[PDB]
């Protein structure tokens, strides 16, 4: 039973579409065109982070807006203080390909990971000495590509292997597993709730994820190319995802489909990082074409631009309370925008 | 075998998945029109804050 | 959603012809190079030939060079393989796949694990 | 007051910065490599006090277009061909045609016919190189066959920036492959090349 | 030929011969004479009485050489005086018979010619630098040292502006006048032997800026990564440090043995070479290492060659000076102008070559011009 198993599967999603069109009475943009806008938005790198070697493919910020961490290829995880430039720590990592990283919501540790399969959390409360590998959460057959931490105790990580997992840090195991996606998970992003994350994958779709019950229970299909980010709206109630196809998509909850499309005719180049601001009027996605784009998530146009990086802008994040945006970038550098 | 496996539970997957309840496109726009333009006035970034308070100078 | 739908196949006299059609939809067609590949029975999956964006540059392997040709028509998001000469060798489940990102002129799509940019395949037999 | 925690923060930073200085010393001389053909396994080797620290993947899934990413800043992309042979030839295709590895180098390394490539029936032994001692014509001109298919995919759309350097089986190559890679980009920053 | 320094100089001499010759003068009897003394112009014993004092001309003279026997005449009154003519002014001279070749005369189109070059090599120099320090993006170990080597060259512009206008000025304050008190106070001073070594020094180190920079290019393609941070310190000591380790032993042996003129007069020929040793040195280095890397350029090519490895070497001839190994009394002319007329623009190809041209900074340029348009 495969050939009438695929067709039944077709006339559910061909229902599924249906059911959707039937709320897609009017769009986003229709109902959106009242709006003043925002107009041209000014920023200028208030503090260029230096001293990574190698390129920088992530960055998280704290809860505090004052201290992030970034990882670099080099095999090193730096923790920046962004107000005065100076670097807190600077964590030695045993992988050199580190492809991820986050900053724990107290900041009591930080995690990184990235082709070695394991996702090392290193503890910054440092009772004895300086920073230590706390825990390492092997069990992945992937890459370690996105990570954030729900608390000090759980976190969630996504890999290659097409799976993400929820990980308890005292015992080092996996309590949940998500096997929906079939392609490379490469980003996820924690609703401001912690109660349900979204992650987007290489299968062009966008899969929302409970963390206590481990099942799936929305998908969006609406790209034409390989998901590289993804970031919940500050609401909890929707994400904008940004995929290789030059195309940013926001995506509602409850919709159940794309509300909106950000793209433009002269950009050609992916997106690799997107990340809302405070109020969420502000779409800030990361491309491939060496600069940053800010997006109006209701109008759908390029309110700003941050072209300061010389070179592909891998992660991109906004702080908790709005202040400021520190961009990364393959040219080994952090460049604070506000 | 593992081929008709994973489709069937595929499929069971996004059986449970349709049935799940939906909200009109426009009360959802509504809603995010709604939240930003409560969360404008405190956004730093919609809003530059004058240099006298900003921390980055 | 992005979706390849491949049509034609089942059996041909070794010698004969055979035309194959795959709809493509959820994506637009003329960006994305788009390629053939096959899975004989006993055996992994092969890329086969594959076409330009606008059609501009064209490949085959030596197995299928000169009784294989490919042609896409951007006017209806439609990919076309015509097949010439059919060995009895040729039999295999006919895929096709798309380029992952646009623009781009690398494709990593002969991969085993089922990947994402490729249809459910239409079984050629000789 | 803030003066003493920020020359403490000052201090830190000033250890860090000694610290990163002496990494980026350590970081610049060794030349990282890639191979294909934990989840990654390293190999150091060192030839003529330089050190090679060469990357092979373990255990990863067969879609690489992403992972490979991480490699657009190494020194060279070792590719190793063991029909297969053209499946390696799609697959270095693959790479020498990446967005993001177009700016590395591959030291190609070959191993191991006529009625897979038909243009084996028209092609003939070049005359700019010559045989190892001992050989047959006929296996030269399969081995030259066979490098010659890798490079005319080099030599379309190489545009100067990375170039391609077969070799038949060695270090003592990839180490001499390095530098050269290493002399041509050198002379592309002044413009020599 | 001869110049107003060179005259001035041999007016020197000539006045210690004059002050000799009358301190060794016998006294005259009758004592019924004229007082001796100095004129500034030629030297006069005691005047006999009712008669015309007679001496050679000055051999000091631009013009001497072309009028050698002629002699200059001076009148004493009856009384045992010069003929004063009045109470205020000098007295009578008759110096007629002498009255008719300097460098910067006979040499005013090539003069004007390295003053254009080194202008433009200043202009296009400290553009480069700014551009340089400002993008940001081109601060790096090669680009340090081209900063460097620029800042060199603005040192070697500067000490040629800084020459050129000192002589002009001192030639024109110098005009219808032979007292030259001013020229004695300033030759005599310790700042001009200062300004002198200040000069040598920056020639000294911009050929040993290009000598770093020749040197830093072969370590790049001969040498495997060394350490960056000592190795650029250890390369801006050798360039600004090293010209010490023989221009300031120059300018103290020079001191301690010769003392006069300035050091303007090697007269020994081997103070001379203690200081050009290193410079013809550091020539013959940066030749050998245009020819390794033109061999090395070659080896890339051969692995259709004709215009890129002429570009190539029409790009490092001005990085590495290798117009100096060929540069390096009889028809001095020619060489003279081309060595002067390369020199000058030397810097401005540089500059041209290494900024304007640089695909990086250009790249840098298009990024700004695009940054401008987003704004
Ligand atoms: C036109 C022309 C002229 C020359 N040429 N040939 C000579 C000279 C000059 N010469 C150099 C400047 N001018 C000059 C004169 C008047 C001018 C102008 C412009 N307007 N006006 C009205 C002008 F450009 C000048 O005539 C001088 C008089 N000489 C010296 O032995 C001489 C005086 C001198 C003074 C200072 C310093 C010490 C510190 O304090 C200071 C006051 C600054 C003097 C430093 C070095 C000096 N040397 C040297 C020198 N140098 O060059 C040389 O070949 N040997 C060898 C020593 C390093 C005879 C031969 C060369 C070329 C290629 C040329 F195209
Ligand atoms: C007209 C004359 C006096 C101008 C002199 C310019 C020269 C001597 C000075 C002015 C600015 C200086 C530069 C300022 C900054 C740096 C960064 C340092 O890490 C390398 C040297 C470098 C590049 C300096 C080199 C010397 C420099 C170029
Ligand atoms: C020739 C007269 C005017 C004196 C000028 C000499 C100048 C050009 C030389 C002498 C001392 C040199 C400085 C000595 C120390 C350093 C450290 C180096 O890492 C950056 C450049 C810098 C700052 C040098 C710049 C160039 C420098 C200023
Ligand atoms: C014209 C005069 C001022 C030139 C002076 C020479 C200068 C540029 C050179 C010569 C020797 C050099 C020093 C050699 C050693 C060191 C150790 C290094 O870790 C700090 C810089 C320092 C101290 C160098 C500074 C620059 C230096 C002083
Ligand atoms: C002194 C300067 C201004 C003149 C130019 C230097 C010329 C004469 C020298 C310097 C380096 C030399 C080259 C070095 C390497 C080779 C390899 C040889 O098998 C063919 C000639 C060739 C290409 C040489 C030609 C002559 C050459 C270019
Ligand atoms: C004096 C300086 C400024 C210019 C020197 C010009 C002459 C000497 C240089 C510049 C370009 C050089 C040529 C560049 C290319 C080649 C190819 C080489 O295989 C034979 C020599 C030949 C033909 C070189 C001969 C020397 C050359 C002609
Ligand atoms: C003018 C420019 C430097 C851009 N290009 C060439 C090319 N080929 C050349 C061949 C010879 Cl032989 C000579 Cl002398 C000069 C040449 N210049």
Redesign the pocket.
């Known amino acids: 039973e495969l050939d009438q198993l695929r067709q039944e599967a077709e006339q559910l999603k061909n229902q599924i579409r249906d059911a959707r069109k039937a709320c897609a009475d009017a769009t986003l943009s229709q109902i959106t065109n009242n709006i003043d806008p925002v107009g041209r938005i000014q920023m200028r790198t208030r503090r260029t982070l230096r001293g990574h070697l190698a390129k920088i493919y992530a960055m998280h910020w704290g809860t505090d807006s004052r201290l992030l961490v970034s990882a670099s290829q080099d095999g090193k995880l730096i923790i920046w203080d962004s107000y005065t430039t100076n670097k807190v720590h600077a964590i030695p990592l045993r992988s050199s390909w580190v492809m991820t990283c986050a900053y724990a919501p107290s900041g009591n540790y930080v995690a990184c990971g990235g082709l070695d399969n394991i996702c090392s959390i290193y503890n910054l409360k440092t009772r004895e000495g300086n920073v230590r590998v706390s825990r390492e959460l092997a069990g992945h057959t992937g890459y370690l590509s996105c990570c954030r931490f729900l608390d000090d105790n759980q976190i969630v990580t996504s890999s290659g292997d097409t799976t993400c997992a929820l990980w308890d840090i005292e015992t080092g195991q996996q309590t949940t597993t998500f096997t929906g996606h079939t392609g490379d998970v490469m980003s996820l992003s924690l609703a401001p709730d912690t109660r349900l994350f979204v992650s987007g994958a290489c299968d062009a779709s966008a899969k929302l994820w409970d963390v206590r019950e481990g099942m799936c229970r929305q998908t969006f299909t609406g790209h034409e190319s390989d998901i590289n980010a993804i970031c919940f709206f500050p609401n909890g109630n929707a994400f904008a995802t940004g995929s290789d196809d030059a195309t940013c998509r926001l995506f509602d909850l409850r919709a159940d489909q794309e509300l909106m499309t950000y793209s433009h005719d002269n950009i050609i180049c992916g997106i690799t990082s997107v990340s809302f601001s405070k109020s969420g009027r502000l779409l800030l996605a990361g491309y491939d074409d060496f600069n940053c784009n800010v997006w109006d998530a209701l109008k759908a146009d390029r309110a700003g631009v941050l072209a300061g990086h010389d070179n592909r802008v891998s992660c991109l994040g906004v702080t908790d309370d709005g202040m400021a945006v520190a961009t990364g970038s393959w040219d080994s550098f952090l460049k604070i925008w506000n | 075998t593992a081929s008709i496996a994973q489709a069937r539970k595929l499929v069971e997957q996004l059986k449970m998945e349709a049935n799940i309840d939906r909200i009109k496109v426009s009360k959802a726009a509504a809603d995010l029109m709604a939240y930003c333009e409560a969360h404008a006035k405190e956004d730093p970034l919609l809003t530059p804050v004058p240099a006298s308070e900003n921390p980055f100078r | 959603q992005v979706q390849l739908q491949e049509s034609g196949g089942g059996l041909v006299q070794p010698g004969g012809s055979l035309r194959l059609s795959c709809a493509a939809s959820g994506f637009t067609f003329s960006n994305y190079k788009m390629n053939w590949v096959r899975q004989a029975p006993g055996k992994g999956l092969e890329w086969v030939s594959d076409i330009s964006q606008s059609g501009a540059s064209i490949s085959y392997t030596g197995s299928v060079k000169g009784r294989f040709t490919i042609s896409r028509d951007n006017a209806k998001n439609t990919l076309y393989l015509q097949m010439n000469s059919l060995k009895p060798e040729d039999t295999a489940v006919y895929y096709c796949a798309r380029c992952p990102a646009p623009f781009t002129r690398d494709c990593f799509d002969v991969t085993s694990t089922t990947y994402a940019y490729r249809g459910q395949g239409t079984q050629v037999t000789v | 007051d803030q003066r003493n925690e920020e020359k403490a923060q000052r201090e830190a930073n000033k250890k860090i910065e000694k610290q990163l200085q002496k990494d980026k010393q350590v970081y610049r001389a060794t030349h990282r490599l890639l191979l294909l053909g934990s989840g990654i396994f390293e190999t150091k080797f060192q030839v003529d006090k330089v050190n090679f620290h060469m990357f092979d993947v373990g255990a990863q899934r067969d879609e690489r277009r992403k992972w490979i990413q991480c490699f657009n800043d190494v020194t060279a992309i070792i590719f190793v061909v063991d029909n297969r042979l053209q499946a390696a030839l799609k697959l270095f295709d693959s790479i020498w045609n990446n967005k993001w590895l177009r700016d590395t180098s591959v030291i190609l390394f070959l191993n191991k016919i006529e009625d897979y490539f038909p243009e084996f029936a028209r092609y003939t032994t070049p005359e700019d190189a010559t045989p190892e001692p001992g050989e047959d014509p006929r296996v030269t001109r399969a081995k030259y066959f066979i490098r010659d298919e890798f490079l005319r995919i080099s030599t379309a759309s190489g545009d100067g920036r990375h170039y391609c350097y077969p070799h038949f089986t060695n270090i003592r190559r990839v180490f001499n492959d390095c530098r050269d890679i290493i002399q041509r980009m050198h002379l592309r920053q002044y413009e020599l090349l | 030929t001869v110049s107003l320094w060179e005259t001035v100089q041999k007016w020197r001499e000539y006045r210690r011969q004059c002050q000799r010759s009358l301190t060794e003068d016998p006294p005259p009897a009758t004592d019924l004479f004229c007082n001796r003394t100095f004129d500034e112009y030629a030297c006069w014993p005691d005047g006999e009485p009712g008669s015309f004092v007679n001496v050679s001309c000055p051999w000091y003279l631009p013009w001497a050489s072309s009028v050698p026997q002629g002699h200059v005449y001076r009148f004493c009154t009856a009384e045992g005086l010069w003929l004063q003519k009045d109470n205020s002014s000098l007295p009578w001279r008759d110096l007629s018979e002498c009255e008719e070749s300097s460098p910067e005369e006979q040499l005013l189109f090539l003069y004007i010619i390295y003053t254009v070059g080194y202008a433009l090599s200043f202009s296009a120099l400290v553009i480069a630098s700014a551009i340089l320090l400002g993008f940001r993006h081109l601060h790096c170990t090669r680009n340090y040292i081209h900063l460097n080597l620029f800042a060199s060259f603005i040192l070697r512009a500067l000490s040629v502006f800084i020459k050129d206008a000192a002589l002009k000025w001192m030639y024109s304050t110098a005009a219808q006048q032979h007292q030259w008190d001013g020229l004695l106070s300033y030759q005599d001073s310790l700042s001009c032997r200062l300004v002198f070594l200040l000069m040598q020094?920056c020639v000294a180190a911009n050929y040993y800026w290009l000598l770093v920079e020749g040197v830093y290019l072969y370590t790049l393609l001969a040498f495997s990564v060394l350490s960056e941070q000592?190795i650029f310190?250890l390369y801006?000591?050798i360039?600004?440090?090293v010209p010490?380790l023989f221009v300031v032993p120059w300018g103290i042996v020079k001191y301690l043995y010769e003392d006069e003129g300035c050091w303007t007069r090697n007269s020994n020929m081997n103070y001379w070479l203690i200081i050009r040793l290193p410079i013809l040195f550091a020539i013959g280095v940066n030749f050998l290492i245009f020819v390794r890397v033109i061999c090395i350029v070659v080896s890339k090519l051969k692995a259709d060659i004709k215009c890129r490895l002429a570009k190539s070497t029409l790009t490092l001839i001005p990085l590495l000076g290798t117009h100096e190994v060929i540069f390096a009394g009889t028809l001095r002319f020619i060489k003279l102008f081309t060595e002067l007329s390369f020199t000058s623009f030397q810097g401005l190809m540089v500059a041209i070559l290494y900024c304007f041209v640089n695909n990086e900074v250009q790249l840098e340029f298009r990024k700004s011009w695009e940054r401008w348009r987003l704004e």
Do not use: A, H, T
């Open positions: 020094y000592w310190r801006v000591s360039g600004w440090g010490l």
